[PDB]
Amino acid sequence: QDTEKMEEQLDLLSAILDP
Amino acid sequence: HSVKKFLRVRIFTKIESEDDYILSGESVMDRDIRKQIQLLKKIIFEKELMYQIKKECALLISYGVSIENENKVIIELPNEKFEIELLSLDDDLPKINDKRANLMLVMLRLLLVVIFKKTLRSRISSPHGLINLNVDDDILIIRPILGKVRFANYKLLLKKIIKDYVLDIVPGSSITETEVENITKLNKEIRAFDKLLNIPRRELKINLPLTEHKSPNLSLMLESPNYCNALIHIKFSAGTEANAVSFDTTFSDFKEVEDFLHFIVAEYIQQ
Amino acid sequence: DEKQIEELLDNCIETFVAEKTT
């Protein structure tokens, strides 16, 4: 499921933005 | 170790010796049956990412994008350069551009995901049959990201040109930029990334002093229809209904916008 | 969802260009 991939990256992204 | 490779992006910074770059940033690389599936999925995914990027870069050869090694592409910008490399853990503390390298990396993956959403949607709705895709059309990965930067450069030069030709010539003037079947769950997911995939555009309005007989108005709009080049749209009207003029113009070359701004300010704006 | 994403990308793109420069 590619929606699963997307949630992984968004999680990753917000985490980079707010460490 | 034969092929297990991930991709990291490093950023190089040009310096005052002006001859060469140096490395200012780098993205990190992080380390039952399902877990072996997970690693295998993240592996195929990134190998796909490098494949598609390489295909897209064929178009960008003119825009400073060079494909050097089968595992590496370099994106050249005036004060910076980017390397995107697919590499194993054998080859090759924080710094300035680490954060930016990490962002470009996540963005890259996200762009592929949207591509996956599109192919699937293309298959769900229309075909009763199979997908149809174009590299030029729907494969955008490097372009949206790179375009954001190139546009910023372009917008900078444009404002310089405007200062020189216009702001400095006419005293009161200044500038103000402004923002220009049920699959729906899918369209909503893709719509969310319209922010990243929208062709970049800003409107620069030039404020001119009001002559008591007539109020001249001038504005320019900058845009990048193919994401990596620039179009400049200039509109000028200084109406006195006896003298009333209107110009609607489009230029692909900053050289000609200088010449047209000059022409405009000369006749119509100047005293 | 959507707004969260639009806000998150707004930040990401901003920080990545470093356009601020002021």
Swiss-Prot record, chain A:
Disulfide bridge positions per record: none
Which range is the signal sequence, renumbered to this chain? none
Q: Where is the protein localized?
A: Nucleus
This protein's superkingdom? Eukaryota
Q: What's this protein's family per the entry?
A: Belongs to the mediator complex subunit 11 family.
Q: How does it assemble?
A: Component of the Mediator complex, which is composed of at least 21 subunits that form three structurally distinct submodules. The Mediator head module contains MED6, MED8, MED11, SRB4/MED17, SRB5/MED18, ROX3/MED19, SRB2/MED20 and SRB6/MED22, the middle module contains MED1, MED4, NUT1/MED5, MED7, CSE2/MED9, NUT2/MED10, SRB7/MED21 and SOH1/MED31, and the tail module contains MED2, PGD1/MED3, RGR1/MED14, GAL11/MED15 and SIN4/MED16. The head and the middle modules interact directly with RNA polymerase II, whereas the elongated tail module interacts with gene-specific regulatory proteins.
What job does this protein perform? Component of the Mediator complex, a coactivator involved in the regulated transcription of nearly all RNA polymerase II-dependent genes. Mediator functions as a bridge to convey information from gene-specific regulatory proteins to the basal RNA polymerase II transcription machinery. The Mediator complex, having a compact conformation in its free form, is recruited to promoters by direct interactions with regulatory proteins and serves for the assembly of a functional pre-initiation complex (PIC) with RNA polymerase II and the general transcription factors.
Q: What else is known?
A: Present with 396 molecules/cell in log phase SD medium.
**Annotated protein name in UniProt:** Mediator of RNA polymerase II transcription subunit 11
Protein source organism: Saccharomyces cerevisiae (strain ATCC 204508 / S288c) (Baker's yeast)
Lineage start: Eukaryota, Fungi, Dikarya, Ascomycota, Saccharomycotina
Name the gene.
Answer: MED11
**Which start and end residues of the full protein are shown?**
93 to 111 of 115
UniProtKB/Swiss-Prot annotation, chain B:
The compartments listed are: Nucleus
Q: Where is the signal peptide?
A: none
Question: This protein's superkingdom?
Answer: Eukaryota
User: Quaternary state and partners of this protein?
Assistant: Component of the Mediator complex, which is composed of at least 21 subunits that form three structurally distinct submodules. The Mediator head module contains MED6, MED8, MED11, SRB4/MED17, SRB5/MED18, ROX3/MED19, SRB2/MED20 and SRB6/MED22, the middle module contains MED1, MED4, NUT1/MED5, MED7, CSE2/MED9, NUT2/MED10, SRB7/MED21 and SOH1/MED31, and the tail module contains MED2, PGD1/MED3, RGR1/MED14, GAL11/MED15 and SIN4/MED16. The head and the middle modules interact directly with RNA polymerase II, whereas the elongated tail module interacts with gene-specific regulatory proteins.
**Function of the molecule:** Component of the Mediator complex, a coactivator involved in the regulated transcription of nearly all RNA polymerase II-dependent genes. Mediator functions as a bridge to convey information from gene-specific regulatory proteins to the basal RNA polymerase II transcription machinery. The Mediator complex, having a compact conformation in its free form, is recruited to promoters by direct interactions with regulatory proteins and serves for the assembly of a functional preinitiation complex with RNA polymerase II and the general transcription factors.
The record's family statement is: Belongs to the Mediator complex subunit 17 family.
Query: What further fact does the record state?
Result: Present with 1720 molecules/cell in log phase SD medium.
What protein does this entry describe?
Mediator of RNA polymerase II transcription subunit 17
Q: What organism is the protein native to? A: Saccharomyces cerevisiae (strain ATCC 204508 / S288c) (Baker's yeast)
What would be the name of the gene that encodes this protein?
SRB4
| Residue window of the full protein shown | 383 to 684 of 687
Curated annotation (Swiss-Prot), chain C:
Q: Where in the cell is it found?
A: Nucleus
Which cysteines pair up through disulfides? They are none
Q: What does this protein do?
A: Component of the Mediator complex, a coactivator involved in the regulated transcription of nearly all RNA polymerase II-dependent genes. Mediator functions as a bridge to convey information from gene-specific regulatory proteins to the basal RNA polymerase II transcription machinery. The Mediator complex, having a compact conformation in its free form, is recruited to promoters by direct interactions with regulatory proteins and serves for the assembly of a functional preinitiation complex with RNA polymerase II and the general transcription factors.
Q: How does it assemble?
A: Component of the Mediator complex, which is composed of at least 21 subunits that form three structurally distinct submodules. The Mediator head module contains MED6, MED8, MED11, SRB4/MED17, SRB5/MED18, ROX3/MED19, SRB2/MED20 and SRB6/MED22, the middle module contains MED1, MED4, NUT1/MED5, MED7, CSE2/MED9, NUT2/MED10, SRB7/MED21 and SOH1/MED31, and the tail module contains MED2, PGD1/MED3, RGR1/MED14, GAL11/MED15 and SIN4/MED16. The head and the middle modules interact directly with RNA polymerase II, whereas the elongated tail module interacts with gene-specific regulatory proteins.
The entry's family comment says: Belongs to the Mediator complex subunit 22 family.
Cite any additional comment in the entry. Answer: Present with 2181 molecules/cell in log phase SD medium.
Q: What is this protein called?
A: Mediator of RNA polymerase II transcription subunit 22
Q: State the organism of origin.
A: Saccharomyces cerevisiae (strain ATCC 204508 / S288c) (Baker's yeast)
Parent protein range shown? 100 to 121 of 121
